[PDB]
Design a protein around this ligand. Structure first.
Ligand SMILES: [Mg+2]
Ligand SMILES: [Mg+2]
Ligand SMILES: [Mg+2]
Lengths: 263, 263, 263
C-alpha cells in the first residue's frame, strides 16, 4: 500500500510536540505487550495520549496504553511509546510506523524496540529475554512494506540495506550490561520473525517458522525497524519470551542500557 | 484489509434466512470444487441462490453453483454452501468468510469444510481423501486475514488460538466411519497449505511447499476455518486429492459422518 | 487487488501504438536495472516516452528510462521496455503488467524478460548471467497476483498453468548460442524468487530464500511472466547477477538470440 502521509504531516506532528514540552530526547523506546511499566522509571515525565497528538494513530489493543511519554531515564532524555500499533488492527504499515519518522524529526538518534514473542528456539524458556540480532519480514516478502510507494529522499534512500539493522555495538553493550546485572539466566539472542496475526499459530506453522531459522515470533516490530533504518536511526531491541511454542527485569535492563547509548 | 461488514449486517442476513425456511440446521457444510453433488443427498431441500440472499457474495468460479441449500442429511438438519468464494476472485477474506458468521447466528455449531487439492505428499494418489489435521496460512503470514481490523467481541476474542482448529474427536470419528465403510484405500490425513492463486504452482514452488511440511495445496478453506474457530464453531474437513503434483465417495462419507457429529 | 483495466483499455493503447509506428514486432523485451543499453543495438528505432502512451504507468526508479522503443534487432522486429515497473513503487500488479497485455494485442508472440538480481547460489559470482529456469512467487502465496479478480477470457483461462512458464526450447537455444559466443564463464541457470522490496534482504532472509531452493532474488519479473503465460506468450529470460549475497555481454547475448526465436 502506498504511503498516505506527506513529509509535512510528519513535520507538523514533530513541531506540535516540540512546542508542548521542553524535553528533547535523543532516544526513543517502543514498549510492546506487557512492557508498558517501563514508563514508571521516568523522572520529569510528561504524557500525551495518542488521541491528542495531531496525525497519530490509536492503540486499540489491551495492554497498550496508547500514550507518548517524555522523561529522563537513567539520566538520559527519552520518549517512550507506551503501547504501539499493529497491522492486525487494520493499520497499513505507513500508519503503524508514523511515530518513527516523527522521532527522527524531533532529533532522536536511537530507537529501542521491544515486544512480547513466542519462543521457537527450543532452548528458550518463558521469561527469557532475547536480544534481536536479525529479523525475517514475511509481510515484506509479499510487498506489504512501510516503504512501499514513492520514496521520500528527505528521509532516506530508495533501496535501504537491512542486513546491518540491529546495531552491533549496542548488541555488545547489552551483553556486558547483562553481566553487570549478575543475572543467572543468560541473555538470549536471535532472529525475530514477523507475521500478520491476530490469530495464534498452528503447530505446522510453528515448525515451518523454526525451520526457516526463526528463534522468536510476533506480529510487530519489523516495520518500525525498517522505517528507522531508512531514516538513519541506530536500532536495537529485545523480545520478551512470553511462552514456549521478566517484564520488570527487561525494564530494569533497558534503564541501565541508557548509559551505554552513544552521544 | 479491514472488515467492511457490521455485526448487524450478519444479523440481518441470518434473520432473513430464518424467516424464509423452517429448517434450523446445527451443521453447515461448504462444498468445494467438484463437490457440489453433496446437496443431492438432501431431503426436504430448500434452495436459495446466493444472489437472492441479502449481503451474500457471489460464486464466479465454474463448478461452484452459488446456492445455499437447507435440508436433512442422514437424519441431520444441514445447510450447505453449494460452491464457495475465493480470494483469487477478487474477494477480501471478510467477504469470502461472510457465510460462516451468518451460520453461527443461525444457531449452527459445527462447520464441515471440503475442497479439491493438489497432493504434495508423495504417498498420495489421485482420488485420495485427506482428513485435514492442520493448516499453513501463507496469506496470513503477510497480514491477509479475515480477522484483520477491529475485533468484534460479540463473535470472539482478539487473539484466537488456531493450533486446535480441526476437532480431534471428529478426526477420530472420521477414521472409525471410514473403516465401517470398508474402503480398500486408507483415509489419508495431513496439513493443508493455502496460497492465493489463481495460477497453478511451479515445480520450485511445489518443492518449497512440500519441504515446508504441507501435504496438500489449494486456494481456499483456511480463512473459513479461522473465522469459524474465532466464533466458536467445531470444525473438521477434507481435501479431495484431484491430482499428484472419489467425489461421490467423499459425499457418501460426509453423509455417514452426520451421525457422528455431537449434539 | 482486483484489476482496474478493461479489455478495451488494453485495446485502446495497442491501437494508439499501431497508429503511430509502422513497426510490427513479434518479440518484446523488458530491460531491467542496468540493462537499458540494449536499445542501443536497435536500427530504425522509434521511441515513445511512457508518459505519452495512453494508459501506461511510469518508471520512477533510477536506471529505468521509462521509454518504449520499437526497432530491428539482429534482423528481428522488436519492441523494448527501456525500464519497467515494480510493486515497491506503489503499483498493484495489474498496472506493473499492463504492457504485457498490450504487446499481445500488438501481435507479439514472444516475451523476453531481464533483471538484475542478487545471487543466492554459492556458485554464482558477480557478472554471472543466469537463464531463468523457474520462479518462486512469494507475493503470489499471499494473493498479490496480477490475475486476481474476474478473469478476462479474451486473454486466457481462469487457472493458468505456470510449471512450463520458461520455454524449454529457448532454454536450449540460449545455451547453444552462449557456446557459439565462446564465453569462458558458463551460462548459469536456476530459480528466481521475487519478493516485494524496496529494502535489501537481511542475512536471515537470504539463508531462508536459498534454503527454499532459490538461486537468485529480485523484486520484479515474476508478475510479467504470469500475465504473459496467461495470454499465451512464449517466455524466456535472464538474471544478471549484480552481487553475491556483464550487462553489455547480456545485451550482446540477447541480440544473437533474436535469430533463434521461432516464427
Ligand atoms: Mg514537566
Ligand atoms: Mg421445504
Ligand atoms: Mg522510423
Amino acid at each position: 500500500m502506498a504511503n498516505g502521509y506527506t513529509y509535512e504531516d510528519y513535520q507538523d506532528t514533530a513541531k506540535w510536540l516540540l512546542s508542548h514540552t521542553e524535553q528533547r530526547p535523543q532516544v526513543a523506546v517502543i514498549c510492546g505487550s506487557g512492557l508498558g511499566g517501563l514508563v514508571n522509571k521516568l523522572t520529569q515525565a510528561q504524557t500525551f495520549d495518542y488521541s491528542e497528538i495531531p496525525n497519530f494513530p490509536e492503540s486499540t489493543v489491551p495492554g497498550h496504553a496508547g500514550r507518548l511519554v517524555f522523561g529522563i531515564l537513567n539520566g538520559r532524555a527519552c520518549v517512550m511509546m507506551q503501547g504501539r500499533f499493529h497491522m492486525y488492527e487494520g493499520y497499513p504499515f505507513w500508519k503503524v510506523t508514523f511515530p518513527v519518522r516523527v522521532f527522527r524529526l524531533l532529533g532522536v538518534e536511537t530507537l529501542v524496540v521491544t515486544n512480547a514473542a513466542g519462543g521457537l528456539n527450543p532452548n528458550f524458556e518463558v521469561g527469557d529475554i532475547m536480544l534481536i540480532r536479525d529479523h525475517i519480514n514475511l509481510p515484506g516478502f509479499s510487498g506489504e512494506n512501510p516503504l512501499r510507494g514513492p520514496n521520500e529522499e528527505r528521509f532516506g534512500v530508495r533501496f535501504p540495506a537491512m542486513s546491518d539493522a540491529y546495531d552491533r555495538d549496542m548488541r555488545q553493550k547489552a551483553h556486558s550490561t547483562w553481566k553487570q546485572m549478575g543475572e543467572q539466566r543468560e541473555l538470549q539472542e536471535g532472529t525475530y520473525v514477523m507475521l500478520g496475526g491476530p490469530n495464534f499459530e498452528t503447530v505446522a506453522e510453528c515448525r515451518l517458522l523454526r525451520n526457516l531459522g526463526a528463534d522468536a515470533v510476533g506480529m510487530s516490530t519489523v516495520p518500525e525497524v525498517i522505517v528507522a533504518r531508512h531514516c538513519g536511526l541506530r536500532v536495537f531491541g529485545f523480545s520478551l519470551i512470553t511462552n514456549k511454542v521478566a517484564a520488570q527485569k527487561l525494564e530494569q535492563f533497558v534503564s541501565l542500557l541508557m548509559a551505554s547509548i552513544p552521544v
